[PDB]
Every structure is written in C-alpha cells, then in structure tokens.
Design a protein around this ligand. Sequence first.
Ligand SMILES: [Ca+2]
Ligand SMILES: [Ca+2]
Ligand SMILES: [Ca+2]
Ligand SMILES: [Ca+2]
Ligand SMILES: [Ca+2]
Ligand SMILES: [Ca+2]
Lengths: 140, 140
Amino acid sequence: NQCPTDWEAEGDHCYRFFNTLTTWENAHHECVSYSCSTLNVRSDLVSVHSAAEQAYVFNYWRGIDSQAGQLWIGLYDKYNEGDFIWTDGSKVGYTKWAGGQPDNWNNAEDYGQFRHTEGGAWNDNSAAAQAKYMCKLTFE
Amino acid sequence: NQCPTDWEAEGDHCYRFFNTLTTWENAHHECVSYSCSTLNVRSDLVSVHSAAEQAYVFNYWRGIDSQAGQLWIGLYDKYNEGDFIWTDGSKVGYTKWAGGQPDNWNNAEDYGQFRHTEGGAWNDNSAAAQAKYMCKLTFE
Ligand SMILES: [Ca+2]
Ligand SMILES: [Ca+2]
Ligand SMILES: [Ca+2]
Ligand SMILES: [Ca+2]
Ligand SMILES: [Ca+2]
Ligand SMILES: [Ca+2]
C-alpha cells in the first residue's frame, strides 16, 4: 500500500470518499486539486471499469455513509448530449444505468452519480443537484 | 503497487535510483523537488531503517549501476557533529557503518553514503564528493 494517507488502495489506484454534499462541478475541481505533476499523478472524479470496481467504490462509500443520497462520479455528457464519457479520459466500457436512466430530464442532466440503492446504479443529474463524491488517483 | 511511474514499490514506500554523479546537497535538493503537498507526499533522500531496507536499496542500486562508486543517502551531521540524523525527519535506529566510520575525515565529512562494497556499508564523506543517489517517497 503505497497510497497517500486518507486514501484507500485497490489495484493500481487510490480512492478517497468525501462525505460532503456539493455540486458535480465543485466535486470535479476538488478531486482534480489532489493531482501531483512531479509524480505524474492525476487525481479525478472516480471512473468505473468493471463490476468489481463498481462494487469496491459502492462498498467503500456505503461503508462510511449511512445517509440516503447519491455519489458523484466522473461520468458526463456535457460536450455531446447522450454520449457519456469519463473526465479522466479512460474508455467507456462499463455502465450500470438504473432503470429509466439516463433520461436527460428537463434537458439539463449531464452528470453521472451512483444511487445509494441497487449496488450503486447510475443516474444522470443536473448541475444544481448535490451529492457526495469520490476521487481516484491514476499514476500515469 | 500504487507507486508513481518510474518509482519502485517496497513496503509503505516508493524508491527511485538516479544514475548521475552529483554532490550530496544537489542530490538532496533533487529528491525533495519531487515532493507533493497536495497529497502530503514527501520525496527525500533515502532513509534506511532495517537490514531488509538496506538490502533492498543496495540491490536496487547495484542491479542498475555496475560502476565502482557510492550512493548518497539522507544521513548527515551538519547540525550536530557525530549525531547523524535523517533529512526526512525519521529517527535513526538501524546503522551499518563500515569499519572506521564515521570518521569525519579532515574535520570535513558530514554526509552519508553507501559504498558499492560489503552490502553497502556506510561512509561519511564531504560536500565536494560526488556519488549517485536514491530518493524515497514517504506518505505523510
Ligand atoms: Ca446536455
Ligand atoms: Ca445529458
Ligand atoms: Ca436522470
Ligand atoms: Ca561537521
Ligand atoms: Ca561529520
Ligand atoms: Ca569517512
């Protein structure tokens, strides 16, 4: 375990859950703010690439947080409506959409989040909504 | 393994060997310049706290550098002559002083280094000496 203190290790990554309500854009900035250019470490909202990473992220979050609510992740379609990508540039092979999602409700939902139910099934929500958030380190 | 690219993982630490002759002070300045305050990651010259870390560092160095020569470590007695301290603030427990060391030769040796001989036994040397160096990450 070579993760920074207050960050959890799993695979080739470190993860850290922030138990504070905020907007997706603010969460994005807060995660990116933990980057370290001298060590080529890129910090970002969590990206999710397998059922096992989903489960990991979900169980880490719900292991700390007992409140009903959502968890921002780095999935978004801001720049191309309908095409959800990761902020960290990683490829989009894994999805876990909740039934009826993504629905771009009121033509204003471009930001992805886990629900606290159904193993962390994903919803698209808006720039005004608030949720907790999870950051991930990528050692480039 | 959660070490940055080009750093080697061992225990709770990451290490990196630089195959470049330089002074201790420059080596120290170089290692520290990799530090990252956003993740509380100290980069510094290597500190050695067991025979196991000693062997790990020695074999890592010698697996790359087959030249006769020395490797700077973060041990120095500039402030208090004869009382060596680690630049990373960790306490000195383990030592592996070569016979007849540390001798403060010519009243002018404040800086610790492995020799390439005898499993990397330590010598103190001066501010004008040149050696290769190794950095270490500490997750503070
Ligand atoms: Ca849109
Ligand atoms: Ca949308
Ligand atoms: Ca929705
Ligand atoms: Ca002295
Ligand atoms: Ca001395
Ligand atoms: Ca000496």
